[model samples]
Target: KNIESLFDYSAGQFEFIDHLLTMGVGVHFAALIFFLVVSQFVAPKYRIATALSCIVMVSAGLILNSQAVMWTDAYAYVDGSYQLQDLTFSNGYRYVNWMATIPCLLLQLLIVLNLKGKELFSTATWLILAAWGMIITGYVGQLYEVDDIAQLMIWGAVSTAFFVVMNWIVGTKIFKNRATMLGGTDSTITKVFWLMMFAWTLYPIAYLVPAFMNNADGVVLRQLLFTIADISSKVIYGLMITYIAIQQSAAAGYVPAQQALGRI
Candidate 1:
């Protein structure tokens, strides 16, 4: 009755998604531990970014854990294969998860860039709104991919439009703010910014994927793209930002950050 029904697949394919989902949870939680331990090396103000990163890790990990459970429940092992059940298994949790995570993600970026006063007020408000727009529209689009390409493309197009704005803001801010940061942090931000930018585009790629291919293999590829995208966007992105904060802290003569500088 639902899109999940179309996923009717072999045991090998089922196991592949199972393993991938497990890996997704594992990587996020593992990164969570790293973020928490290394967070102390940065200055107090910079701690917020790490904290946001922590939130991202926890939320992403939990959702992936939930996603794995949903995947299992969505299918029944019958005969020699896995078959979709009547009750739908939804990846809709993904939309809910992004709502919790991406806004904080933009907030972390805003904090790291050192926005304050009205700059912080306006950028935080508008950028996060754009993020919401992307997530919401993407969610709606994904719902239609089982059969309705028009709705899928309509919402996907809107989501991509929102993404364009988010990407523009991040690009301008990273470049504009680079001059005031420590040399090490400056180059690092440039590297990380491009990384984040590239990683995020993977979502749109994953979005277009189902429109072309709706089979279980498409499902596998979609999950693969999304999980990889999350690692770069949340894990690697936050790690670099924390390191950048640490470098900036050392430059400012924060004793703790300075002493810990060479170790990481």
Candidate 2:
């Protein structure tokens, strides 16, 4: 028997995917790449959405990779002694998740702001305030701990539908019509858009694919499937969305000099 094993839980649970984790360390690598690409050609019409999407998708990317933190023995300093519930109140990871809410609210705020490029701000300010009210209240209520599954699902449905609507407006306008006036019909923008859309398909598969494939033995082939989906959600999907936003921001001329350091 090994004498006093070092759990090394500091690395966290996601170690099973160390292969891809080594590729870029985390989703921020690709997020930053797409950020650079977009900063090169973004426009004001798409500025707010791009900024908001960058933050939102990056948060999602982190959450996707964070799945690993839930399991694995490597991160535990102690040997099978405690569950995650034993961690102190508002641990570091918990704080990180909480900070993610700020960006989420900003995204929600953009929905009501209806700020269209240079034509930002309008008569809809009151409606925007109402939307903020719903979002902030919903977030606060979530902190209080909602135990009812039905209520959870209802809230999830409403918030998700709201996000989808806003995404549709931004994505459709930015990519579908190429309304940025970049004057370049080159394949770059179109390619990035399609790639982003393609990567998004990994979301459902992340959950469903593993479920259907579960063997009667009850072991999750956690390594392969989770890594693939994590990469898609963390890097590919996120990069594409960031690409769209940066490109749009650049085109609108809202991007500042330092922010647009590259692609000059």
Candidate 3:
């Protein structure tokens, strides 16, 4: 049987993945500082959203570092490349990281939306619930992906359904609030939503990697996609949200935020 596994992979492969991990972790923490620094310029109500973004960045930084250390711990340089040891690795951590941070992401979204009281609590629970549902099912399907293709197909479909439900909520209810947001936000906030969705789409595609390419090469490719999407949906996304806060704060007659806008 030509059954493939991630038991053998080249040094370049290892390094490229390492590069991505390094870059992803690096950018997250750097923006962690940036987010906190600019946070004060925003209006008081939006400040908590910006401050919590630091917590999200800290989690992402550590979680990605978890993925990196797990990689090196599970492999060693032998012959011309990195080879898997008897001890192995799992692609599980990234999904856990998503489960951890996505609630924060969605909550921050609601904060900037200025959704309050009953509507805020109710909508936050739905978005957070849908995110957890999507990631949990998707990770389980990935565990069965290479060996149990049918399970992958079924659970992945279920996972995709959660995504559909989230999108429906966003399009119908969440974004419907956008037009009523600060005028400057009307143009840019919509763009951020599109950015978020596009970056997140990469993870589902990456999850399907083992189904199609169940080998060492596919291992590298999948990690690449995960980190790229991770950095995008987290750090870059945080920056975008922070920018939105700065803009909204500016519109509300906060002079420091207004002056800082041009400096950015």
Candidate 4:
């Protein structure tokens, strides 16, 4: 087949964009709900949860828009090969979105835990920087296409190994310390941390689908898996943070601003 549909929009690709847009709306709505809850009910101590929810919502907007741009403006099936803005089969926009959002997501975890001291700052910095490095390497590999599979695998392995090790240290050491920091809800917060880690681990695995499948199949698989991971990591994770904030605020003997005013 000599191919006939170079640069023509794939309806399937547009359908995928609808999912991203839908999630964007979902996350924005989640933020709006949380903002109202904070203003009307939540106390000052737990306001960080509100701030983080808003931050994640903003990042979700960026992510969804970036992905939309990728599929609509960057994507092309040129001469029987996937292409992104003249770059052959490179997922540059996806990685660019990850670079912007991943560090913010990691920062949310650190903030939620109320991490402090040199270890806290250093660890947070390391994790964010490491995330940047991992995504950058992945983007580079994509740009190189099949010609750099070995290089891609090696860098991916090293980055992932470091990612896992660092996350373990953060979870085991810094995140566990939240129990004492919060004075209660240790189990709840710790479970959230682990849950987030589990969700995040799926991202790198999703990155590997392109290496195994044909380009079209790989595109579909990557988008679907990434969307699942995004929902788990952002929406579910934000809900867990809200849960922790409520529990911790109650445990700390703080009443909702609304309740304090006898406004329910």
Candidate 5:
């Protein structure tokens, strides 16, 4: 319902959305592989946590991205043109991916940052709820048409507010409390937080694309922006988290598997 019909597809029927999903799948799996390879270098406790998080992260990419593929798989090619059975496919699947994966990403940060006691559980819980709110409102916003574009903008604003609040709370309060928890690597942790915020800013811009331009051009713009944002946010961000974990664990004098062999 949110996709602009004017730019849906034709001929060779190239879909940037498909390309985006393919990238998402590949990037996430690469992250998963990296995590597995690094597990031996991290503390035993963190090894389990890192492995589980990467697995779930990869699963979110596969589950959500596969749904996107399913929706577009049956495009008909004939007479030098490609035709979609349903051009107005609501794009709800995209939100389904965000709903699950955003929270997964947040939980990973909370775990890696080592938030404690109530601050740990409370912040994770609230942020997850806030993330869900952001995506849910976003999905609704995508359902409106030009005449009711106001509704779309309104919901977009609401969703953005939720996302902003989550980041602000995490960046200011939660992260501040975790300063000692992150040890000498606090600056790197701060960098990660800011990077997440910067990456997230792209979503609202992409969300407003349909409002600004209803043509296929706008649709293409939105897809490209989202693709870049997703890759940076998840894959790049996850790698940074892994690096932080390794550095901090080493600072704590945790033994890498290779070094521990001599002790055994």
Candidate 6:
């Protein structure tokens, strides 16, 4: 009586689920290793800056990650037939990924690369604008009835494209270029660091995506996926901190501390 076939068992379900739960924990692990490596290279003067940046990155990511739990609440209420809204409304701020963070992130990249703003005040002004803009977008997206998954993907791809171009321009053509005084790293280590960061990011996206796509009604596995994705994405913080540390070390070796102006 073909019971096994009727049940429709699939392989790797538990493994994938486990992946969803532990992705953020993996970030904490990666951060520890990152901290050690960075602290070894950097001096005390710049250590606080690097540490603060890492902390902000991790905290913001974790805040974004809380959406996982929030989505569960939405499901619970929706299933109970309380207010019975669309899936997107219940999903809370997750959609803001596309509307808010993606746009500001692009602006931040331009500022970092020194491409959009020639003056520090100009760049700072843009960042302030982007931050408030993100808050507004988050509110607007939630207030209105805009929660389609496909629509979010549209902007996600746009943001990803923006990120890649920004990286190439700022990391390579601007700071890392031979003509630029900022100069470049040793190359081999930089390549490995970037590769690790990318792989670390992709693993969660693979694990969490199917859950979202497979859900019935308006509900999707968005909570679980965002949890894993944001957690895995925290590796970027480690990378950024370590890069700052290494950069400071190189800067110190070239310039005398007493004569060094402003911050390195």
Q: Which candidate comes out best when scored by TM-score?
A: 1
Per-structure clash totals for the candidates: 0, 20, 0, 0, 3, 1
**Highest lDDT among the candidates is held by which one?**
1
Candidate 6 lDDT, 1-264, residue by residue in tens: 111111111224323433453455456545644654445445564455345434544453444345333322323223333231333223334334334433333332333232333543454454444434443443332232233434334434444444454345334533343232222433333443364346434423532243344332112243344454454344453355345345545555734322232355
Q: Give lDDT tens digits, candidate 4, residues 164-194.
A: 7667666866455665656255667678777
Q: Cα lDDT for residue 105, model 2?
A: 29
For candidate 1, write residues 87-189 as lDDT tens digits: 5666788779888888888767677777767987888888888989999999888877777878889999999999999888877887897777772776777
**Cα deviation of 135 in candidate 2 (Å)?**
16
**lDDT of candidate 3?**
0.79
* 143 Cα displacement, candidate 6 (Å): 10
* Model 4 per-residue lDDT at 66: 57
Clashing pairs in 6: 212-221
Ranking by TM-score: 1, 3, 5, 4, 6, 2
lDDT of 2 by residue, 160-193 (tens): 4544553454455445445333423223444554
Task: Give the higher-TM-score candidate: 3 or 5.
Answer: 3
Q: Give lDDT: candidate 4, residue 190.
A: 72
- Provide the lowest-lDDT 10-residue window in model 6: 1-10
Of candidates 6 and 2, the better by TM-score: 6
**What TM-score would candidate 2 get against the native?**
0.43
Off by over 4 Å in 4: 1-10, 32-36, 73-90, 117-119, 181-184, 257-264
Tell me the spans in candidate 3 whose CA falls farther than 4 Å from its real position: 1-5, 262-264
Q: What are the per-model C-alpha RMSD values against the true structure?
A: 1.6, 9.1, 2.4, 4.9, 3.4, 9.5
- Candidate 1's TM-score: 0.94
User: What is the clash count of model 3?
Assistant: 0
> Candidate 3 on 1-264: residue-level lDDT in tens?
111234578888888877777877888889898988887699887787887789888888887787677767777888887877765667677688778888888777777777778988988889888988998998788777657878888999999999999977765554688876783776676777888889889988887777777788887778778787878788777887777788889999988888887776
Q: Model 6, which residues run further than 4 Å from truth?
A: 1-26, 29-41, 44-49, 71-168, 172-232, 250-264
lDDT of 3 at 192: 78
Cα displacement (Å) at residue 257, model 4 = 6.8
